[PDB]
Write a protein that binds this ligand. Structure first.
Ligand SMILES: [Ca+2]
Ligand code: NA
Length: 323
């Protein structure tokens, strides 16, 4: 269809193209139809575009998992509903064991497949979410940016903003870290970055007056959020700069969705976000792995009962728009 783009604040949630994933604390994440996803997720990321079978070759694609029991046509129409509600639906390129190892030249074909998928299913953009091994694999750092420049240009002809987002793990965002080529090559092209502030154990940063602030330290959660974001939006403390109106804070829905990084007390985030707002640099929103985890069960089959979006949806949607 057309591109449904986002000009305001966002709550981003990832969508599993599989059923009954097992959690880090023994819980379960079911497959769900798009239509069931909470409306306050105004960007939903279909996970994942990848290589399904090497017989098909090196270029990744998307195949709707049949175990979900949703026809390709129904799926397409659910996308159309989300668009009529003004919500976006992106394709997330990558994930674990995606086998994305592209060679120079591949960008033509990759641009072409992204466009095809976009016209077929009515996606509005694409999220780069490479696994660790894919970040610096073969020519990925050249090919993927180059393809997406061509996709962005294609949709400009007809006045559309094909969204481009990224979900780097945060330690790769140091100055001249492994993700810097993706950022630099696509500066001017990307809508916003939603880094993963989870699954990195005791990585973090040092702050004079406070000390060592780790991503897995609940006692210091308020400071972690504030200082890491402050560092990114200002380009200080040896972090590569991401403007504040283009930074989205990525988090786990609950303790089953990631091993570390879950926020026990939402007030830590609320406060940090107000320090950032009051210094004249409000963030663009939050992100979560994942909607399926927000709608899932712990290891005794109690429902997580949409706790993440309960904690953050109104907070974020009732903030003033970005400039
Ligand atoms: Ca922390
Ligand atoms: Na669309």
């Amino acid at each position: 269809g057309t591109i449904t783009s986002q000009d305001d604040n966002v709550v981003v949630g990832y969508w599993h193209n599989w059923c009954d994933g097992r959690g880090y604390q023994g819980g379960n994440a079911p497959c769900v139809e798009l239509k069931t996803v909470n409306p306050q997720y105004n960007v939903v990321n279909i996970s994942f575009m990848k290589v399904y079978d090497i017989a098909e070759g090196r270029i990744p694609t998307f195949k709707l998992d049949p175990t979900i029991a949703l026809s390709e046509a129904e799926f397409i129409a659910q996308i159309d509903t989300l668009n009529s509600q003004g919500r976006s639906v992106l394709i997330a390129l990558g994930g674990a064991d995606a086998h994305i190892e592209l060679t120079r030249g591949d960008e033509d074909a990759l641009a072409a497949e992204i466009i095809r998928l976009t016209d077929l299913y009515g996606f509005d953009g694409l999220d780069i979410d490479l696994e660790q091994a894919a970040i610096t694999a073969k020519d990925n750092q050249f090919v993927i940016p180059a393809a997406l420049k061509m996709v962005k240009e294609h949709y400009r002809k007809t006045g559309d903003n094909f969204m481009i987002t990224m979900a780097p793990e945060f330690p790769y965002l140091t100055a001249n870290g492994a993700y810097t080529p993706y950022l630099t090559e696509l500066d001017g092209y990307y809508d916003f970055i939603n880094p993963q502030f989870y699954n990195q154990g005791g990585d973090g940063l040092w702050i004079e007056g406070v000390g060592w602030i780790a991503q897995n330290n609940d006692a210091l959660k308020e400071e972690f959020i504030y200082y890491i974001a402050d560092s990114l939006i200002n380009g200080t403390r040896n972090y590569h700069k991401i403007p504040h109106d283009k930074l989205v804070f990525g988090l786990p829905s609950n303790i089953d969705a990631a091993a570390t990084g879950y926020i026990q007390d939402p007030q830590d985030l609320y406060k940090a976000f107000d320090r950032l707002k009051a210094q004249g640099q409000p963030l663009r929103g939050v992100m979560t792995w994942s909607v399926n985890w927000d709608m899932g069960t712990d290891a005794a089959n109690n429902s997580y009962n949409q706790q993440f979006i309960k904690d953050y949806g109104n907070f974020i949607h009732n903030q003033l728009p970005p400039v």
